[PDB]
Amino acid sequence: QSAGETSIATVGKEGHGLTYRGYRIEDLAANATFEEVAYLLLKNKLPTKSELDAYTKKLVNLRSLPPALKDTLERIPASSHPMDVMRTGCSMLGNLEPENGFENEQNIADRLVAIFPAIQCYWYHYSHHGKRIDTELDDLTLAGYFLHLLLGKKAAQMAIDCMNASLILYAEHEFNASTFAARVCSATLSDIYSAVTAAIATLRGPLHGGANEAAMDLIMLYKTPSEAIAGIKRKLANKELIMGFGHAVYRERDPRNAIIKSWAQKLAPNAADGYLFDISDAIENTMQDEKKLFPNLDFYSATAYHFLNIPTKLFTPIFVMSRVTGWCAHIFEQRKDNRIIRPNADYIGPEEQGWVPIEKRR
Amino acid sequence: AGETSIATVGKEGHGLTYRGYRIEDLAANATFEEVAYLLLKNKLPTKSELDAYTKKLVNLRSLPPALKDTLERIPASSHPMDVMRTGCSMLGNLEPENGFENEQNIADRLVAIFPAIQCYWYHYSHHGKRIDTELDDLTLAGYFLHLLLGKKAAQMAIDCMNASLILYAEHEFNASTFAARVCSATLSDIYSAVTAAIATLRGPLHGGANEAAMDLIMLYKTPSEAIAGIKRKLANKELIMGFGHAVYRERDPRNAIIKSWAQKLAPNAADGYLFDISDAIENTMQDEKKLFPNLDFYSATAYHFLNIPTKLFTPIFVMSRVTGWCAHIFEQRKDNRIIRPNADYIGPEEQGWVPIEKRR
Numbered sequence: 001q002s003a004g005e006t007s008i009a010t011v012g013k014e015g016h017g018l019t020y021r022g023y024r025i026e027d028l029a030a031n032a033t034f035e036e037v038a039y040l041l042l043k044n045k046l047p048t049k050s051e052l053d054a055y056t057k058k059l060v061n062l063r064s065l066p067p068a069l070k071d072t073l074e075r076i077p078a079s080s081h082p083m084d085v086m087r088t089g090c091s092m093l094g095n096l097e098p099e100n101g102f103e104n105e106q107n108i109a110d111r112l113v114a115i116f117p118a119i120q121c122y123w124y125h126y127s128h129h130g131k132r133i134d135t136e137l138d139d140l141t142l143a144g145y146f147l148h149l150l151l152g153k154k155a156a157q158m159a160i161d162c163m164n165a166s167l168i169l170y171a172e173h174e175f176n177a178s179t180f181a182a183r184v185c186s187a188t189l190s191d192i193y194s195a196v197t198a199a200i201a202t203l204r205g206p207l208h209g210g211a212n213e214a215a216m217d218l219i220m221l222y223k224t225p226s227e228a229i230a231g232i233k234r235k236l237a238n239k240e241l242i243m244g245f246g247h248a249v250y251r252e253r254d255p256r257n258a259i260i261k262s263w264a265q266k267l268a269p270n271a272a273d274g275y276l277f278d279i280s281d282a283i284e285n286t287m288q289d290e291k292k293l294f295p296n297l298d299f300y301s302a303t304a305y306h307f308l309n310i311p312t313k314l315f316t317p318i319f320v321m322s323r324v325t326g327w328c329a330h331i332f333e334q335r336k337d338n339r340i341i342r343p344n345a346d347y348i349g350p351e352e353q354g355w356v357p358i359e360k361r362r
Numbered sequence: 363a364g365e366t367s368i369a370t371v372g373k374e375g376h377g378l379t380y381r382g383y384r385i386e387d388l389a390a391n392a393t394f395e396e397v398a399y400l401l402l403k404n405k406l407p408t409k410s411e412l413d414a415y416t417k418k419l420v421n422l423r424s425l426p427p428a429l430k431d432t433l434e435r436i437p438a439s440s441h442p443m444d445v446m447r448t449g450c451s452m453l454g455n456l457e458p459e460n461g462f463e464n465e466q467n468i469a470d471r472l473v474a475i476f477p478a479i480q481c482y483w484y485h486y487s488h489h490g491k492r493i494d495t496e497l498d499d500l501t502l503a504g505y506f507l508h509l510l511l512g513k514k515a516a517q518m519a520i521d522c523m524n525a526s527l528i529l530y531a532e533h534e535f536n537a538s539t540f541a542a543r544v545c546s547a548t549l550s551d552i553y554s555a556v557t558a559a560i561a562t563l564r565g566p567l568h569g570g571a572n573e574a575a576m577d578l579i580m581l582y583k584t585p586s587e588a589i590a591g592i593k594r595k596l597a598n599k600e601l602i603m604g605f606g607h608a609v610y611r612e613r614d615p616r617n618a619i620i621k622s623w624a625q626k627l628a629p630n631a632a633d634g635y636l637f638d639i640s641d642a643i644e645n646t647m648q649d650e651k652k653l654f655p656n657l658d659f660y661s662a663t664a665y666h667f668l669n670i671p672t673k674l675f676t677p678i679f680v681m682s683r684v685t686g687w688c689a690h691i692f693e694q695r696k697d698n699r700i701i702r703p704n705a706d707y708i709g710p711e712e713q714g715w716v717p718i719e720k721r722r
Contacts, residue, residue, distance in 0.1 A: 001701050001702060001703060001704045002703075002704055002705070002706055003703035003704065003705060004703075004705055004706070005705060005706050005707075005708045006705045006706075006707060006708065006709065007707075007708050007709030007710070008709060009709075010707040010709060019712060019713075021709060021710060021713075022709065022710035022711060022712055022713035023713050023715065024712065024715070027715040031715065031717070036718075046716060046718075046721055047718075047721070048718070048721040048722050049718055049719070049721075052718065068435035071431065071432075071435060072431075072432050072435065072452070075428040075431060075432065076452075076455040076456075077455065077456070079458075080455045080458065081458070081551075084451070084454055084455050084458070084551075084553070084554070085455070087451050087454070087554065087557060088448065088451040088452050088454070088455055091444070091447045091448040091451045091452075091557070092432070092436075092448050092451075092452075094444055094447070094448075095435075095436045095437065095440045095444055095445070095448055096435075096436075096437070098439075098440065098441070098444070174704075174705055175703040175704060175705040176703075177544060177547065177548050178548075180544060180703045181541055181544050181545065181558060184537055184540060184541050184544070184562055185541065185558075185561050185562045185564075185565070186565075187537065187565070187567075188537050188538075188562055188563070188564070188565025188566075188567045188568040188569070189565040189566055189567045190561060190562060190564040190565035190568075191441070191444070191564065193444070194444070194447065194560075194561035194562070194564045194565070195561065197447060197451070197557060197558070197561045198541060198545075198557070198558040198561040198562060200554075201545050201550060201554035201555065201557050201558040201561075202544060202545045202548055202550060202554070202558060203548075204548070204550045204551065204554045205545065205546075205547070205548020205549045205550035205554070206548070206549050207547075207548045207549045208548035208550075209548070248702050249702075249704075340537075341363075342608065343363040343364070343535040343536070343537075343539075343540040344363050344534075344535055345363060345364050345365060345366040345534055345535040346364070346365050346366075347365075347366060347367075347370040348365050348366070348367055349366065349367030349368065349369075349370065349379075349381060349382065350367070350381065350382035351382060352372075352377075352379055352382060352384065353379075353381075353382035353383050353384075355383065355384070355387040355391065356406060357391065358396075358406075358407075358408070358409050358412065359409070361406055361407070361408045361409070362408050
């Protein structure tokens, strides 16, 4: 099912172990900041200390929302889907700060990575609470920044670390519905905001972007592990689809699950509803025992974010905040080797009809 | 890559049908609304059905105040196709689909309102005036020309426009249509899928051929200049917009229809000499490179003779193709199968970790 070529990221040869530009996800999630992996993805190398310092500072000074963008977010209703807010926010920024020539690629990517957390949170707070938040905050890290904008106070260190690792985990994942969309878009020589908007529009779909949101809803149905075992079996006998399990590509394991699971387990003890982790473990055991399926990244991602006090409806915009690095990376690559597979459709419609004038219809 | 019942180019790259009906019979006999109905509702409408539908779209021409507010804040220098992008996306925030049972209500709204989105932006950003979008014109083609130019157009102008919106309505799988399906394949809403198609159609390799053809045509004052100047572009390897096609072999059946309209319009246009320039270019492209003109070539002069500014050619593609797009989105939702794309990895092998202290 070959749609093209990438140097950016890979799942292993016998289906084992993820890498970004050759570096293991286990090493990245353990040892790197998100800024660092955005540098790897966007710039094609691991930054030195100096390079990281400068990059990290460049992004901190790109946290201003243009007046006409605020105007627009203030007019998106509270009831609108948070991913539609991202969609519009990106598109409108593109009207106000157009890419123009492609030599500005990197600067727009950097602007998007820096500002996406503010677009979501400014809309969230204005539309839900009538409050215009200050988005020009001094948080040194992007993980901390988001959590500061969202919760209104600087985050504890363990919270920063978890959020940071989650962003790394969601940054990039080869060809997938949304990254593909971004590449189809770039292959027509469209601007970078078009491509990212297209990808957001594609990620908005619950079969692609919203699995941890559905997994949180599911986990929260149950007070005890037993209830969850029994409730999952009822869903399986009723052939209902449980989100966060199995993957279109991997066949035994999702390398990112272990990392995110480790974090959820770490955050559980200092959480009001830390019992939800054991509910989740019970669900996992039951999906394995019954239909031999393993959890993907989205499953334990649900409890991690929840234990960070992130509202369930805001799970999906965080994927944009991370995966925008990967998208932009794939967009840069399409631009340099612009070949795309032309879609052709098999016709299964009617054969050439004789014209029927309107006076003779029914 | 997938299946469709919506349209096809004929078996050996000849001719074109929408749901079995020939483009020639559609352009000659049908209104755009009638053609939108065929694509969206999957049948040719009766008189009664077409009448109610035509009237339905006339009363879907109001822009919500919030959307106007947003259109007012897009600079005049913003690509008009980025305007359609944000307009579609924002309308989605304002009037969400909320369940696929509302599919048809939203598609009708998009088809009815896209002209107003473009023209309201355009006149505010370029002229500083807030136009009335709730005009009483009975036909969508004539509505767009009235909005754009500030007066009802002549019948010949309405007919041409109508024909052009029919010709652009749908054309199988293509970059833009495929993005609509890819988007729908994840169970995204209708506004997301359309917005993605617009973001894909924004690229000039796909959506801006007629604009590029107008720039080209315009380099030349006389036919003689056209011939020597194309010949210099050909000997320089570079390639000319509006010529050739991936699927068609001998001719693009939409070409003949649009060329006829351009030909009819030339005499009464200030600068109708541009047809003869186009005609000379076409002739040289046959003689030198055996290539035929595609829809986008004489679409250039047709729209130009309709007094459409060249930069505003591309949004017309959206006004027409939204019908095809929506058609494909409905069909994808009913048989939600799509090939999951894999890549061939051409990158580095597994690298050992380097602590930050240790780099360079």
